[PDB]
Design a protein around this ligand. Structure first.
Ligand SMILES: [Zn+2]
Length: 257
């Protein structure tokens, strides 16, 4: 019964998921002075023009915007990756206040939120098989700061009322995830894990340097979601982020100087 409260939050997760204290856990602090530029990293290739969104779901921990991943329609390639990784869903982590909410931090700076575009390695055939492999997933992480509105996020904001509580879903077709990207694709990369149980160590992380800006009103609407199901005492869906984990024997690489 893991979650983000005092009694079931990230300091507890190790009791059901011992990998929580593992060698390549996520998120991490990105120390920008110690990350090394790696001139051998290729530019990233984000091919989302044929992306087919289907549905949006409140899963009790976050909301997921789900995609049709039965063919190579929206893929991530290049960068640190070998092969082709298919988009399956995106979600966010965010805070109760603008001073916190992101999972990765940059020189200990916390952003208001963090977007995760989750992709799986097509060499493993499906998502469930991919998460059992050390190179099974590529997660594109994008920070959110509060400032100007993000026009391409507003369709997401406007559907959240219809999925307020755990287990609720809604049709969510024709959403274009290109409208969530910053201008630059400069990134940091490192090997890590899912940041929620089961905390599997199967992720190549690709964290963009450039945040996107969202409005105060936009993030206030994320904070009206609920962790509870319908007809349960209201617990607002806020601070659904895991804090930074020990880097251990890992090097964070930069794509840029
Ligand atoms: Zn996430």
């Amino acid at each position: 019964h893991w979650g983000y409260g005092k009694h079931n939050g990230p300091e507890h997760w190790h009791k059901d998921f011992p990998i929580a204290k593992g060698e390549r856990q996520s998120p991490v602090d990105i120390d920008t002075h110690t990350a090394k530029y790696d001139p051998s990293l290729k530019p990233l290739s984000v091919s989302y023009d044929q992306a087919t969104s289907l549905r949006i779901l409140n899963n009790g921990h976050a909301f997921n915007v789900e995609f049709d991943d039965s063919q190579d329609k929206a893929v991530l390639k290049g960068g640190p990756l070998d092969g082709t990784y298919r988009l399956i869903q995106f979600h966010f982590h965010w805070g109760s206040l603008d001073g916190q909410g992101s999972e990765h931090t940059v020189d200990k700076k916390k952003y208001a939120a963090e977007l995760h575009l989750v992709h799986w390695n097509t060499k493993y055939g499906d998502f469930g098989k991919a998460v059992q492999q050390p190179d099974g997933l590529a997660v594109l992480g994008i920070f959110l700061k509060v400032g100007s509105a993000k026009p391409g996020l507003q369709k997401v904001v406007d559907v959240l009322d219809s999925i307020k509580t755990k287990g609720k879903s809604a049709d969510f077709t024709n959403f274009d995830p290109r409208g969530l990207l910053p201008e630059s694709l400069d990134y940091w990369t490192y090997p890590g894990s899912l940041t929620t149980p089961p905390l599997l160590e199967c992720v190549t992380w690709i964290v963009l340097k450039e945040p996107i800006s969202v409005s105060s009103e936009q993030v206030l609407k994320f904070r009206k979601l609920n962790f509870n199901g319908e007809g349960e005492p209201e617990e607002l869906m806020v601070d659904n982020w895991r804090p930074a984990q020990p880097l251990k024997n890992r090097q964070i690489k930069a794509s840029f100087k």
